[PDB]
């Protein structure tokens, strides 16, 4: 099927582009119901939790805002009291009550502070010439609760520190750490910091056994008693940051509540609207057209017409660059030009590539017809992931049912690439059985490929090239091909479909558009096509064409300009090539 411009258009119409947007701020965790409900359960139960999702989602900011609105009983006074001259314990009194027990002490009613005083009893008995309590923290309301985010999870920052007054130390030189500041509230840490700082094991001991030991230096130290920890801990990281941790059975025992962010949201008016109020709350001066373009770029970032990228921080960053190009104002134009300027800043590699193609240094065809050749499409695996055409050839000779991937044999192709070649072999052997095993040897090459290549998305290009070489069928060179194939010859979805289409358009444009150029791709990728304006306009102009197919043979038909049947069709030509190859091989 031909995809009309109307079928391809995906962008949101803009009405009144320059009108200022006025919208209220959405709540924390909008569109992230799963994670919000997980966290509510952790708050309700007192459970420790972990927040998981890809980078730049705004997980930390959403979490601090959600915690900001909570309420808890005012946290107790928190202090170190000596039980000895080499021993200390961590103690809570009801809030404020510290300053009174301190002044009573500062002399020379507190049922909780028993052991401190008992043990505070023989300077008189021996003239025996370091003793007053050490307030770590206090506060006036548990609303908001204590919220301590410590991004740098070293032992001293987690657990506090012993200072040394020349060498001596005592109860009053013990400084608190994040764990101490987070009591009666929330401690937030990054999974990655716990790993990198080597503090995961000591952090477990703190939570499993109440062992919280201030950091010392390798003279003579104070013993610090364990203490019942009163805090909720929330770890933050990516799916991958957590896999180190999840191989420790203790991780699951301690961190029961998974709060997982989706990398995308539904592309809905409600989510557009929420995006708008969020941007306004961040301080942007936003116009309707500016909101619309940012929303649609989020859909394009997701490569899904019906979903949008949920990475609020990436959206904000693009908006910040747009705001500069609009002189402080976030407009449709400013966003389109921020996007263009990102591509320009990263375009050197493609400009070198296109120049090499124009010069004939890389040999590519974008017009005419040839047997056993086709433009497939690849993506370069360095950000921002440009797509390019790659010339592929297939050559057929009389022989013993061999399909040879030259790139794979030379060590350039990977396991999935290899798998796609094997799959085609399975299709071809079983599809053409009249001569027993296939009387051809077929060799496939990515002609100017010098790098490792991986994936199954050249399967369609390979199979059509192969059928073309078997049948001596000239194929159009103005249509590039992308698609995976299964053993039955159906065409399957591929990735990076926008970059691929746009990459072939870019080469066609640099070599001069013929008016008949285009791309054959999987029907299964229709919902991923969120093509840039320039390709859409070319397709609207009849200057570029997109075909969607379900089977390999459908692709061959388009490329060879005939049907498989209605014989004089392709199938009889294919069968005739195979008979010719079998006569050369046998007789």
């Amino acid at each position: 099927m031909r995809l009309s411009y109307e079928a391809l258009e995906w962008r949101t119409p803009i009405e009144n582009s320059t009108e200022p947007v006025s919208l209220p701020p959405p709540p924390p965790f909008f569109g992230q119901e799963r994670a919000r409900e997980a966290l509510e359960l952790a708050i309700r139960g007192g459970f420790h939790a972990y927040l998981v999702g890809p980078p730049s989602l705004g997980k930390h900011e959403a979490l601090l805002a959600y915690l900001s609105t909570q309420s808890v009983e005012t946290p107790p006074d928190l202090l170190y009291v000596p039980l000895s001259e080499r021993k200390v314990a961590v103690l809570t009194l009801p809030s404020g009550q510290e300053i009174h027990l301190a002044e009573a002490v500062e002399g020379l009613r507190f049922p909780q502070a028993r052991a401190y005083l008992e043990a505070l009893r023989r300077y008189a008995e021996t003239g025996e010439p370091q003793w007053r309590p050490n307030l770590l923290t206090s506060s006036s309301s548990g609303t908001p609760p204590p919220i301590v985010y410590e991004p740098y999870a070293t032992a001293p920052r987690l657990f506090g520190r012993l200072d040394y007054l020349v060498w001596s130390t005592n109860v009053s030189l013990i400084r608190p750490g994040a764990v101490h500041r987070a009591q009666g509230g929330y401690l937030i840490l990054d999974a990655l910091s716990l790993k990198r700082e080597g503090t995961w094991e000591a952090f477990k001991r703190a939570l499993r056994n109440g062992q919280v030991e201030p950091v010392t230096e390798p003279p003579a130290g104070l013993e610090v008693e364990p203490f019942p920890i009163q805090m909720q801990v929330i770890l933050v990281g990516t799916p991958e940051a957590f896999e180190g941790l999840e191989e420790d059975p203790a991780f699951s025992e301690l961190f029961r509540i998974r709060a997982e962010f989706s990398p995308t949201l539904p592309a809905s008016p409600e989510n557009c609207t929420a995006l708008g109020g969020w941007l306004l709350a961040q301080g942007f001066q936003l116009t309707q057209g500016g909101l619309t373009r940012l929303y649609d770029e989020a859909r394009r970032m997701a490569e899904q017409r019906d979903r949008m990228d949920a990475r609020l921080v990436e959206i904000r960053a693009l908006a910040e660059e747009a705001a500069v190009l609009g002189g402080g104002l976030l407009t449709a134009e400013s966003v389109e030009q921020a996007i263009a300027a990102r591509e320009h800043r990263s375009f050197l590699s493609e400009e070198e590539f296109l120049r090499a193609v124009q010069e004939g240094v890389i040999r590519l065809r974008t017009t005419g017809r040839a047997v056993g050749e086709v433009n497939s499409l690849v993506v370069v695996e360095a950000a921002p992931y440009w797509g390019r055409p790659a010339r592929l050839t297939a050559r057929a000779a009389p022989g013993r049912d061999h399909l040879i991937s030259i790139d794979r044999e030379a060590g350039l192709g990977g396991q999935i690439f290899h798998k796609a070649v094997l799959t085609l072999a399975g299709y071809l052997r079983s599809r053409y059985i009249e001569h027993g095993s296939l009387p051809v040897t077929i060799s496939l090459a990515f002609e100017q490929n010098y790098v490792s290549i991986e994936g199954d998305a050249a399967g369609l290009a390979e199979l059509v090239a192969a059928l073309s070489a078997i049948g001596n069928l000239p194929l159009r060179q103005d249509l590039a091909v992308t698609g995976a194939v299964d053993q039955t010859g159906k065409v399957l979805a591929v990735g990076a479909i926008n970059a691929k289409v746009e990459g072939f358009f870019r080469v066609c444009k640099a070599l001069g558009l013929s008016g008949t150029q285009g791309v054959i791709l999987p029907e299964a990728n229709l919902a991923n096509l969120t093509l840039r304006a320039e390709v859409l306009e070319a397709v609207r102009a009849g200057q570029f064409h997109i075909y969607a197919v379900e089977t390999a043979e459908q692709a061959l038909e388009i490329l060879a300009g005939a049907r498989m049947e209605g014989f004089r069709g392709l199938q009889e030509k294919i069968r005739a090539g195979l008979e010719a190859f079998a006569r050369l091989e046998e007789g």
Binding site: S376, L377, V378, V379, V380, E381, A382, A390, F417, N449, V451, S452, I453, E454, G455, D456, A457, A458, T482, V494, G495, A496
Partner: peptide
């Protein structure tokens, strides 16, 4: 850089 199809 390596390439994906």
């Amino acid at each position: 850089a390596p390439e994906a199809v």
